[PDB]
């Protein structure tokens, strides 16, 4: 269970100073959404961050000092009016998350079978941890209410990363010293998803 049903919800109980919208609009036929940043899925603000360098964004972004968890908002139920706007006005996503696990995992979805799929073998070949989850694996992220599905074509990629894959990135692991203490790594990582991108969406 989330604490808010909706975003409106979450504005209208929420100090607007603890939490952040944040856009980038490039005209990228690709879009990075990362709807659970700063504290809820800590590192997806960084990594959202990097990729911006070369496609457009859109981050959520919880920034309280603890109780990070109530600003989660389910994808089916993500309905922010920046990210309704950045979503349809964009080709294709990749959107990213973060799940609890000391292991380091990536678990790759989403309804562009052939990109996930993609996907999982570049970031193995290149020595990262990554399986491919299939259409009947629980939050798959194929929902038509996913907010990463609603694109000019409604095909995603969605990136889920472990606890422990996600603290390999950085130095110091807090909402402060993330984005100053991104590691060789967080580099590695990045490069080979713009390597991706930029091959596997001409
Ligand atoms: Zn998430």
């Not at 972004?61 to 706007?85: C, M, Q, Y």
């Not at 996503?93 to 570049?122: F, N, P």
């Given at each position: 269970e989330d604490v808010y049903q909706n975003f409106e919800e979450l504005k209208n109980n929420?100090?607007?100073?603890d939490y952040g919208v944040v856009t980038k609009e490039t005209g990228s036929p690709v879009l990075v959404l990362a709807i659970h940043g700063g504290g809820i899925e800590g590192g997806t603000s960084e990594v959202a961050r990097e990729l911006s360098k070369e496609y457009s964004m859109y981050l959520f972004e919880g920034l309280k000092s603890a109780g990070n968890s109530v600003l989660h908002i389910t994808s089916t139920h993500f309905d922010e009016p920046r990210a309704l706007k950045m979503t349809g006005n964009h080709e294709y996503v990749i959107s990213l998350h973060g799940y609890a696990e000391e292991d380091q995992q990536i678990e790759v979805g989403g309804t562009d079978r052939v990109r996930a799929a993609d996907l999982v073998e570049k970031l193995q070949h290149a020595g990262f941890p990554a399986v491919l989850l299939n259409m009947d694996h629980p939050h798959a992220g194929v929902s038509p209410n996913n907010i990463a599905n609603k694109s000019k074509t409604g095909l995603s990629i969605q990136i889920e990363m472990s606890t422990g894959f996600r603290k390999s990135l950085f130095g110091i692991f807090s909402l402060k010293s993330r984005a100053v203490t991104q590691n060789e790594r967080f580099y590695e990582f990045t490069e080979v998803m713009f390597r991706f991108l930029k091959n596997s969406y001409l």
């Amino acid at each position: 269970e989330d604490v808010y049903q909706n975003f409106e919800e979450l504005k209208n109980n929420e100090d607007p100073s603890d939490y952040g919208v944040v856009t980038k609009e490039t005209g990228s036929p690709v879009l990075v959404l990362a709807i659970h940043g700063g504290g809820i899925e800590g590192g997806t603000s960084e990594v959202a961050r990097e990729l911006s360098k070369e496609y457009s964004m859109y981050l959520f972004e919880g920034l309280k000092s603890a109780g990070n968890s109530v600003l989660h908002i389910t994808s089916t139920h993500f309905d922010e009016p920046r990210a309704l706007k950045m979503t349809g006005n964009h080709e294709y996503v990749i959107s990213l998350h973060g799940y609890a696990e000391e292991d380091q995992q990536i678990e790759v979805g989403g309804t562009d079978r052939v990109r996930a799929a993609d996907l999982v073998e570049k970031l193995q070949h290149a020595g990262f941890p990554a399986v491919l989850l299939n259409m009947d694996h629980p939050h798959a992220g194929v929902s038509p209410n996913n907010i990463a599905n609603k694109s000019k074509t409604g095909l995603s990629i969605q990136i889920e990363m472990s606890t422990g894959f996600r603290k390999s990135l950085f130095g110091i692991f807090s909402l402060k010293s993330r984005a100053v203490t991104q590691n060789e790594r967080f580099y590695e990582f990045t490069e080979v998803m713009f390597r991706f991108l930029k091959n596997s969406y001409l």
